[PDB]
Amino acid sequence: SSKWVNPEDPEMSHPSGLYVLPLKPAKPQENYIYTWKKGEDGSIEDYVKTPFKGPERAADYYTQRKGNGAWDHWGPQGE
Amino acid sequence: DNNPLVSVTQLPMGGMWQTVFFIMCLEWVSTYVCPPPKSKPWDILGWSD
Amino acid sequence: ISKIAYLQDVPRTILEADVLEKLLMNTPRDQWEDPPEDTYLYTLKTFAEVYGPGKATKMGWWDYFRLKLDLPPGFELLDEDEMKVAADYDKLMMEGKIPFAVPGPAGFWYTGAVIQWKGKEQFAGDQVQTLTENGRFSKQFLANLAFYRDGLKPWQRGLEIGMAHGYFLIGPFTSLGPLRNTPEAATVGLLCGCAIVGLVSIGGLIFGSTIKPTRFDKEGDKPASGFIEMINWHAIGGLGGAGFAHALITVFG
Amino acid sequence: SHAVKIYDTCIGCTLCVRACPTDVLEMVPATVNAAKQVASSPRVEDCVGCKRCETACPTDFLSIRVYLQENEETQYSLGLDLADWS
Amino acid sequence: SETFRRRRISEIKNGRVAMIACMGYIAPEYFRWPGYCSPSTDLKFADIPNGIQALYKMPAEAWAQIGVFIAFLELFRRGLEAEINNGRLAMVAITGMISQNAFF
Ligand code: CLA
Ligand code: KC2
Ligand code: KC2
Ligand SMILES: CC1=C(/C=C/C(C)=C/C=C/C(C)=C/C=C/C=C(C)/C=C/C=C(C)/C=C/C2=C(C)CCCC2(C)C)C(C)(C)CCC1
Ligand SMILES: CC1=C(/C=C/C(C)=C/C=C/C(C)=C/C=C/C=C(C)/C=C/C=C(C)/C=C/C2=C(C)CCCC2(C)C)C(C)(C)CCC1
Ligand code: SF4
Ligand code: SF4
């Protein structure tokens, strides 16, 4: 009764072991970093989440990670 | 000499100028790099955040 | 209260009126009906149900002695002000505010200040507020460090950082090196400081080649280009600062 | 990740499921035993390897076995908190 | 751009300091201030030399105090065209004079 379908082997269950498909957000969160934001009137904030165009660290190790699963092994249903 | 006013004169000019320079640097940092808010000019350490 | 049978007309001998009032105030209201077994109110209930008007009006000397031993005196229970202070303390801590204190000798002093312990992200342990990192002075100082300063090119950042690093690095070898007593102490220390600058810059180049930070990179530029530029200019600035310190030492003895 | 396997000696007492710290296991209908249920391990990706299921297993030798695989360690099996591999 | 503005400020400043250095090179030979530059060590302006030798001669304490004063100063349109042109001339003159003193 699990909606998840195993991509590698349809007969077996999905590696996730879940029964409800994921819910996508209205707009996916964009990459950001916590930095200061000088207030233009002498003030300054400490942890201000500000957009970041690309990966904070462009190493192949960092960028290869998609978060779909432990090894990104979940099918398209993971997203 | 134990008298502090005599000890000032007994101290080397090296140490005296080092002290003056250190206090000048502290003042510069506190008044230009990390100026206190206009509402609390005495809040040097930025407690009012 | 009147609805409590055992609390009605409790004889003065079993417990004084003032001490009874203090005990009731200290105890939670919900526990008056049937207090837990290990409480002064439970002892009072158990013994008032057996002794008092309309019941046993006498007690053995030893039984009364034990009863007075195990019932509370007035000074043992908390006062109104003490209970208020404890309640305010707990309320502050639960609201996420911390009555500021600094540890002292085998203890901590209260500075009289209430700070906002919890940050913008309540569940984030990285964002708990502290004067050391989240105060205005600390924020401004860290933001104005060369690594962070606004409107600075990576070469400027690296040059300033390296100037500082080399200038202070030459000294330890000059003063405490094997050749510290020889006439070439300053020059050997300068060489050692330049070597240290080179080693740390090589480490930074490895870091930028492996992790590749992209916070200093220009738009549409190779990843970690800004970081590598900053590290190269840190090497240059370290050489320059070491040389300047050595020149000052040599010229001014 | 570790390998959590269940064998037919299972009697379906649910103690492994109740002892699971990260909810890797779940009871499923079966006809092999009198209890008419056997523990399963669908979410083995979350198994940390604490062997609390193994501790709670009653059978003479365990009807549930956790095989540790240090080479295939993931962040979920390592319980990483300060660092994120996702 | 930002680089041009920074370079303009740097040039103006290097020109001002170069006029100052040229004047400080020229004046001492003509005349020198009296009054025991360093009374503690019995040092006087007539005794101190002019040029790169002053760096070694006058005490490191005096040089450090001068440096502290400059640090305080730093930390705390025909006229402008003439200023910048004279800055260029003075920079050339001071670099030439210092190079000549060091070489010879
Ligand atoms: C930690 C203990 C220790 C200390 C204090 C020293 C000290 C010394 N050793 Mg060493 N040594 C040690 C352990 C130590 N050794 C050990 C374990 C061994 C055996 C492997 C040796 C073997 C050894 C040899 C064979 C020799 C020395 C020598 C020396 C001298 C020069 C070292 C040098 O060039 O440093 C270079 C120093 C630096 C690069 C700077 C690092 C330290 C700075 C000052 C830290 C500053 C941090 C700062 C406060 C942060 C502020 C941040 C922010 C707030 C601004 C010096 C007296 C030499 C000598 O001739 O001695 C007389 C020498 O030939 N040592
Ligand atoms: C006010 C704050 C202050 C700061 C922040 C500060 C920092 C540093 C640093 C780090 C940045 C270094 C590396 C450093 C080094 C030396 N300091 Mg110094 N110093 C300060 C104060 C004094 C005083 C009062 C005296 C003094 C001295 C010396 C001597 C002695 C040399 C010698 O005796 O040959 C040496 C080597 C004495 C002196 O100049 O004696 C002639 C002296 O009286 N310092 N000092
Ligand atoms: C232009 C920048 C400048 C300023 C703003 C400035 C301010 C003050 C103040 C103000 C608060 C005091 C109180 C003071 C005191 C002394 N100064 Mg100083 N001074 C400056 C420059 C020089 C130079 C070039 C020399 C010098 C000296 C001395 C001596 C020691 C004399 C001696 O040697 O007996 C003493 C007592 C001489 C020196 O250190 O000689 C080893 C020396 O040559 N100063 N100086
Ligand atoms: C920002 C900046 C900076 C930075 C820095 C950094 C970031 C660094 C890092 C660095 C690094 C990152 C380094 C590294 C190092 C390394 C090492 C130290 C290694 C070692 C190794 C080993 C030990 C190995 C071994 C082996 C072999 C080889 C083979 C096989 C076996 C074995 C494994 C044993 C600087 C200061 C420049 C300046 C300013 C700016
Ligand atoms: C906390 C504390 C402190 C600390 C301090 C410190 C940490 C300091 C630092 C210091 C430092 C660390 C300094 C440094 C400086 C540096 C310099 C001053 C440099 C300069 C340089 C130059 C000038 C260069 C040049 C060049 C180049 C760059 C290249 C080419 C060549 C030439 C030569 C041109 C004290 C003790 C006060 C006490 C109180 C508390
Ligand atoms: S694995 Fe063990 S505890 Fe779990 S149902 Fe089977 S026999 Fe019972
Ligand atoms: S080892 Fe621990 S986490 Fe893994 S299945 Fe057994 S009880 Fe659950």
PDB file of C-alpha atoms in Angstrom, chain C residues 4 9 19 48 70 86 94 104 119 121 124 144 158 167 192 199 201 218-219 224 235 237 248:
ATOM      1  CA  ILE C   4     -11.125  21.670  53.174  1.00  0.00           C
ATOM      2  CA  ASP C   9      -9.917  25.028  62.958  1.00  0.00           C
ATOM      3  CA  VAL C  19       2.970  28.718  59.823  1.00  0.00           C
ATOM      4  CA  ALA C  48      -5.358  16.798  62.046  1.00  0.00           C
ATOM      5  CA  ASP C  70       8.504  16.507  61.682  1.00  0.00           C
ATOM      6  CA  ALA C  86      11.792  32.193  41.963  1.00  0.00           C
ATOM      7  CA  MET C  94      10.994  29.723  29.929  1.00  0.00           C
ATOM      8  CA  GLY C 104      33.417  34.364  39.114  1.00  0.00           C
ATOM      9  CA  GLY C 119      17.966  34.131  18.554  1.00  0.00           C
ATOM     10  CA  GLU C 121      15.703  30.967  14.834  1.00  0.00           C
ATOM     11  CA  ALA C 124      18.892  26.956  16.204  1.00  0.00           C
ATOM     12  CA  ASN C 144      35.109  45.321   9.590  1.00  0.00           C
ATOM     13  CA  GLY C 158      44.812  39.201   1.329  1.00  0.00           C
ATOM     14  CA  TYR C 167      54.985  41.454  10.465  1.00  0.00           C
ATOM     15  CA  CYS C 192      61.782  31.752   9.005  1.00  0.00           C
ATOM     16  CA  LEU C 199      53.636  27.355   4.179  1.00  0.00           C
ATOM     17  CA  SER C 201      49.726  30.305   1.872  1.00  0.00           C
ATOM     18  CA  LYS C 218      33.056  37.788  -8.962  1.00  0.00           C
ATOM     19  CA  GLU C 219      29.914  37.004 -10.924  1.00  0.00           C
ATOM     20  CA  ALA C 224      37.427  29.951  -5.858  1.00  0.00           C
ATOM     21  CA  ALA C 235      51.635  35.521   0.594  1.00  0.00           C
ATOM     22  CA  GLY C 237      51.675  40.812   2.020  1.00  0.00           C
ATOM     23  CA  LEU C 248      62.650  48.392  11.226  1.00  0.00           C
TER      24      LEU C 248
END
